[PDB]
């Protein structure tokens, strides 16, 4: 088999994990109580797979997930929610208090007495794995818990297990929209560490998915209960290769070795075909040829990043449903055929491909309509450095006068630690320039 762990840290991930496990259970005919009246009716099928869900003797199934956010008023929603009789009650609500946008509490002060259990219950989970492992950690950058905690966890995990893929689906801080003033402090301080431990940190933005939700989905007034689902589908579109069959299936490690030229540039993006509403569910064929153009459209990017201000290093596409390989080959050729899309000289190969048969499902209460096929795209480009530029500059201004810092120092973080990340992130930006520049002889 293959196994994969879902961890949700903070609120942003937990709220998502609610969206994720909802889809997973639905996609696999599983009921909220872990039961399988569909398996009762069928009498067969391994659908309730060990990829994501354990199983007991009673026919109940349990997902491989934990979570913690140091905020009981969220997890408790799940302890009372419809899925309360799903999860293992050893979900770690230690939320005596919250990190409150302060990295240091989650990393140093109150990261204590919490992380000891996170690792423990994790070990218990790995001990049930007779196969692959790989970690899905859901957090938000700029946050007080989604970072200061998730810095510790990946560090400890790089020690206990080390030789496992450690993936992250994470909210990047937007250029304009912010729910805090300390995102830049909180964000940059994080990158100093997760750069070294992780191997692939899939990033997203809320501004982009917002605009997306308006245009294609015809949604005037979105909220987290519509955004997360898109973020959930993407995660499925990845992981579906593990649970279902397919002509060209992919594991998690396959991504790591193809998208990641050098150890330190593991910061890619994502898109999809959520161009769907019940009205526009018609009037289009939704061919392999259409979507692939869309999957390079600047507008349908999930972060506020102009690719056309940079170049592509490597890319991977994961299709679902009734999909024909030949049609993919024509389509990818077309994508090279276009001149706006500038690749590095390095990679005439450029592309990876993966394909599954199992089409997407739809959640009732939802918006994205039914289809016969869909794709997910991932991409590593240089354009993001500009976004990294924004955060380093925002930092620069409100650090110079050392604003807000006495708080972080008030928890014990030394002044210079700020600069340490800065020199790093500047050097990181410098790396994107080195590589982006064409080669010579």
């Amino acid at each position: 088999m293959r196994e994969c762990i879902s961890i949700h840290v903070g609120q942003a991930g937990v709220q998502i994990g609610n969206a994720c496990w909802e889809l997973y259970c639905l996609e696999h005919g599983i009921q909220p109580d872990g039961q399988m009246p569909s398996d009762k009716t069928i009498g067969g099928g391994d659908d309730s797979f060990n990829t994501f869900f354990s199983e007991t003797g009673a026919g109940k199934h349990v997902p491989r997930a934990v979570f913690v956010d140091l905020e009981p008023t969220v997890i408790d929603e799940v302890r009372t929610g419809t899925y309360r009789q799903l999860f293992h009650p050893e979900q770690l609500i230690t939320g005596k208090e919250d990190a409150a946008n302060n990295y240091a509490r989650g990393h140093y002060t109150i990261g204590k007495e919490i992380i000891d259990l996170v690792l423990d219950r994790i070990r218990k989970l790995a001990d049930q794995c007779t196969g692959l492992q790989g970690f899905l950690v859901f957090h938000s950058f700029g946050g007080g818990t989604g970072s200061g905690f998730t810095s510790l966890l990946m560090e400890r995990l790089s020690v206990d297990y080390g030789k496992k893929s450690k993936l992250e689906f994470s909210i990047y801080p937007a250029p304009q929209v912010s729910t805090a003033v300390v995102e830049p402090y909180n964000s940059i301080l994080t990158t100093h560490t997760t750069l070294e431990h992780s191997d692939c940190a899939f990033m997203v933005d809320n501004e982009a998915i917002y605009d997306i939700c308006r245009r294609n989905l015809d949604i005037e007034r979105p909220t987290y209960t519509n955004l997360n689902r898109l973020i959930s589908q993407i995660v499925s579109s990845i992981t579906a290769s593990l649970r279902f069959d397919g002509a060209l299936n992919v594991d998690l490690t396959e991504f790591q070795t193809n998208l990641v030229p050098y150890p330190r540039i593991h910061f890619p993006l994502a898109t999809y075909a959520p161009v769907i509403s019940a009205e526009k569910a018609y009037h289009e064929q939704l061919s392999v040829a259409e979507i692939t153009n869309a999957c390079f459209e600047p507008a349908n990017q999930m972060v506020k990043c102009d690719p056309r201000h940079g170049k592509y290093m490597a890319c991977c596409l994961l299709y679902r449903g009734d999909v024909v390989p030949k049609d993919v080959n024509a389509a990818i050729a077309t994508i090279k055929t276009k001149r706006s899309i500038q690749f590095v000289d390095w990679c005439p190969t450029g592309f990876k491909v993966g394909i599954n048969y199992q089409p997407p499902t739809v959640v009732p209460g939802g918006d994205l309509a039914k289809v016969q096929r869909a794709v997910c795209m991932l991409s590593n480009t240089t354009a993001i450095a500009e976004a990294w530029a924004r955060l380093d500059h925002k930092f620069d201004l409100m650090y110079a006068k050392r604003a807000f810092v006495h708080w972080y120092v008030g928890e014990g973080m030394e002044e210079g630690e700020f600069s340490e990340a800065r020199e790093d992130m500047a050097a990181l930006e410098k790396d994107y320039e080195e590589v982006g520049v064409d080669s010579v002889e």
Binding site: G131, D251, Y262, K326, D345, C347, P348, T349, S439
Partner: protein, 429 residues
């Protein structure tokens, strides 16, 4: 009787194996259970070529499966013909290489190759007269390549007198699957050329165009392309299992095809295909088959001969035919299109004929070619390689498993050398 061990390694191979036996079973009157229900002893006189027998007049194939890192394991077993395969021959591990050759050669495959090799020894010892080995794989990937060449070498040391054949899907010029194929393959070629008697270079792109235009199929799948690969695999050995006016075998193919020990890569082809409609709009003749046979668009290798020349070919026909028309037709080709052929080989072609046609055809043929056009594929992989190597574009992933720069370098020198060798004879004299 001559006996072969067939091996499956990699997502692409096992499916080819999967489609393969489905054809052989049909060519021998066997069911998904392994029972006989045919109508001719000919389907049984030489069944021991590919299969072993079992108690209740069942017939087990000599197939082995080694990259069943389980994701494709169920795919094979829960299939229309999954059940015939020896369950004990389902060898595997876990934690797939992620297309990293080194994992597929040095670390993981190292742990597993013993076991698969042990099983091979059994199937070997159970034979009466072992001839050669038949591996399916692909380059560019981790398992099919690394574990392949590993397993190929060891077997060669154990059976160096014997034959080792492969049918290896090659990386494309244009449409990639993985992004490190230049890395994954060139390493393979380094070990492939040196530990092989022949290999059949197949490209996906040609198969697409082939099925797209001549077969006039608008929705082809990986399931159907393979259906053509299995044909050639069967045609090469039709004269082995079945009789004819003029017999052929694997050893007889090489010695007439391999002038120099390193130029043992080939460009196969197969006839006839007509998209069902035009079936009413032709008739099957020897010149007809020959015409498709040397068709520049029926070459599944994607190396246009017309920019190069042939060293030697083998045109294995199958059915009731007259030899005069056969031998005449090759001569015509040698005559009219002589510039595509070598002077210093006086006759640039051989032949072979088996008197047993396939399931629903009156006459069929199989093409085998050795040509200078193969240079082009080899340049591509080399040119793609260097552009990445000099910057160490993806290198760090292998070095984490213990490879070093020399190894990547070594293969490069070797691959370029193979090119130059072909280029030696590329110019007419």
């Amino acid at each position: 009787m001559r006996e072969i061990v067939h091996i499956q390694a990699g997502q692409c191979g096992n499916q080819i194996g999967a489609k393969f036996w489905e054809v052989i079973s049909d060519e021998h009157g066997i069911d998904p259970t392994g029972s006989y229900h045919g109508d001719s002893d000919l389907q049984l006189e030489r069944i021991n070529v590919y299969y072993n027998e079992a108690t209740g007049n069942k017939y087990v194939p000599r197939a082995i499966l080694v990259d069943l890192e389980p994701g494709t394991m169920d795919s094979v077993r829960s299939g229309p013909f999954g059940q015939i395969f020896r369950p004990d021959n389902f060898v595997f591990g876990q934690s797939g290489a992620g297309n990293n050759w080194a994992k597929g050669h040095y670390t993981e495959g190292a742990e597993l190759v013993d076991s698969v090799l042990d099983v091979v020894r059994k199937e070997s010892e159970s034979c009466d007269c072992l001839q050669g080995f038949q591996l399916t794989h692909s380059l560019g990937g981790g398992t099919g390549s690394g574990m392949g060449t590993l397993l190929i070498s060891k077997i060669r040391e154990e059976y160096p007198d014997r034959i080792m054949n492969t049918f290896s899907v090659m990386p494309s010029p244009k449409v990639s699957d993985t992004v490190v194929e230049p890395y994954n393959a060139t390493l393979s070629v380094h070990q492939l050329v040196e530990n092989t008697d022949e290999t059949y270079c197949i490209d996906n792109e040609a198969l697409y165009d082939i099925c797209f235009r001549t077969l006039k199929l608008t929705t082809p799948t990986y399931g159907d392309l393979n259906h053509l690969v299995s044909a050639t695999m069967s045609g090469v050995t039709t004269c082995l299992r079945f009789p004819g006016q003029l017999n052929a075998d694997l050893r007889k193919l090489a010695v007439n095809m391999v002038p120099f020990p390193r130029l043992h890569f080939f460009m196969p082809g197969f006839a006839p295909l007509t998209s069902r409609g035009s079936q009413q709009y032709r008739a099957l003749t020897v010149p007809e088959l020959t015409q498709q046979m040397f068709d520049s668009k029926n070459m599944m290798a994607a190396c246009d001969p017309r920019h190069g020349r042939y060293l030697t070919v083998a045109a294995i026909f199958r059915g009731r035919m007259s030899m005069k028309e056969v031998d005449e037709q090759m001569l015509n080709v040698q005559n009219k299109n002589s510039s595509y052929f070598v002077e210093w080989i006086p006759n640039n072609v051989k032949t072979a004929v088996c008197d047993i046609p396939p399931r629903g055809l009156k006459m069929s043929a199989t093409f085998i070619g050795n040509s200078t056009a193969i240079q082009e594929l080899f340049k591509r992989i080399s040119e793609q390689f260097t552009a990445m190597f000099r910057r160490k574009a993806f290198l760090h992933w292998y070095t984490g498993e213990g490879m070093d720069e020399m190894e990547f370098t070594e293969a490069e020198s070797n691959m370029n050398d193979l090119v130059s060798e072909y280029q030696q004879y590329q110019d007419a004299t």
